[PDB]
Structure formats: structure tokens, C-alpha cells
Amino acid sequence: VNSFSGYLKLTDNVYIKNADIVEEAKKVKPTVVVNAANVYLKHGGGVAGALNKATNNAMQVESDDYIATNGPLKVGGSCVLSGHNLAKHCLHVVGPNVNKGEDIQLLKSAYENFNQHEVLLAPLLSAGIFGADPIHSLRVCVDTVRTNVYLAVFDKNLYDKLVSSFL
Numbered sequence: 354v355n356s357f358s359g360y361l362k363l364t365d366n367v368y369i370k371n372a373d374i375v376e377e378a379k380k381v382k383p384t385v386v387v388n389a390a391n392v393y394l395k396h397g398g399g400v401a402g403a404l405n406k407a408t409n410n411a412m413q414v415e416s417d418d419y420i421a422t423n424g425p426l427k428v429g430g431s432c433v434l435s436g437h438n439l440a441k442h443c444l445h446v447v448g449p450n451v452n453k454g455e456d457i458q459l460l461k462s463a464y465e466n467f468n469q470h471e472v473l474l475a476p477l478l479s480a481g482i483f484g485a486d487p488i489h490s491l492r493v494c495v496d497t498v499r500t501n502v503y504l505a506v507f508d509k510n511l512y513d514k515l516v517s518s519f520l
């Protein structure tokens with residue numbers, strides 16, 4: 354039993370809710386919140402911009418030190434950093450950005466990072482400003498993630514479409 358509330362159950366391990374991931378993390382304080390990161394951990398917009406703003410830019414400060422030490426992530430890769438005031442940890446995961454021409458096949462590799470954590474609060478990878486089809490992102494999530502994932506979808510119209518079209 355966990356404290357995630359109001360989710361629809363899609364499969365044995367995947368749950369979904371029309372919610373603002375910033376507000377969900379602030380309420381639940383999950384062990385792991387997933388950020389929709391880029392390889393430079395430049396948290397400018399979309400989910401990353403919102404998560405970072407909620408940390409008063411502390412996420413960006415920590416991320417800049419991480420990049421200065423380690424260099425950029427790989428598309429499809431991830432790193433674990435602090436969750437600041439939102440969660441114990443933040444798993445920064447890089448899904449492919451379609452508006453950069455990146456290989457959508459890398460979306461499965463991106464979701465594989467979730468399997469290293471027993472429970473996560475997450476957005477749909479490569480959705481929003483990353484330019485992929487969210488119905489496809491949900492499909493890849495369900496077919497790749499085996500650990501317990503709680504998906505927050507900001508847009509109510511999209512959530513209904515994802516639910517209604519979910520096979």
C-alpha cells in the first residue's frame with residue numbers, strides 16, 4: 354500500500370491520473386519523481402522547467418555541478434539526483450526529442466531506467482514539448498516498465514484520450 358490517490362489502474366503495474374506532477378510530488382513526496390530531462394540537464398520548460406521552478410532553482414544548481422563533473426547524459430539515459438522539496442530522489446531521464454530528430458526507438462531505452470526503482474511518479478516520456486505521440490509513449494511505458502509507475506498527465510483532454518484509447 355502507498356499514498357498515491359485517485360489513479361486509474363491500467364495494468365498490473367501502471368496507474369494514471371490527470372494531475373500536475375509538481376503538485377502530486379509536493380503532496381505525496383514520493384521516493385522517486387521522474388524528470389523529463391535533456392542531456393545537458395538544462396531545465397528550461399515543460400515538466401523540467403516546472404519541477405525546477407518548484408525547487409527555487411536548486412535542481413538547476415545541482416544539475417550544473419553534475420554536468421561540470423560528468424558531462425552530458427546519453428539520449429535514453431538517466432541519472433539520480435536529489436528530489437529537493439519534491440521527493441527523496443529525482444530520476445532525470447532523457448527521452449528522445451522528436452523536434453531534434455532523435456530516434457523514437459530510444460524511447461524504450463529511456464523507460465528501461467524506471468525498472469531500477471520499485472515505485473515512481475512520472476510523466477509520459479517524450480510527451481509535451483519533446484514532440485512524440487503520447488498514446489505511443491503510454492504504450493511503450495506499459496510494455497517496458499515492470500516496476501510500479503504512477504503517471505501524471507497534465508492535460509485533461511489528453512488524459513481522457515489516453516484512457517479511452519488504451520488497449
Ligand SMILES: Cc1cc2c(=O)n(CCN3C(=O)c4ccccc4S3(=O)=O)nnc2s1
Pocket residue numbers: 373374375399400403476477480481482487505506507508509511
Ligand atoms: C507540468 C507539466 C506536465 C507535462 C506533461 O504531463 N506532459 C506530457 C503530457 N502532455 C502532452 O503530451 C501534451 C501535448 C500537447 C499539449 C499538452 C500536453 S500535456 O498534457 O502536458 N508534457 N508536458 C508537461 S509540462
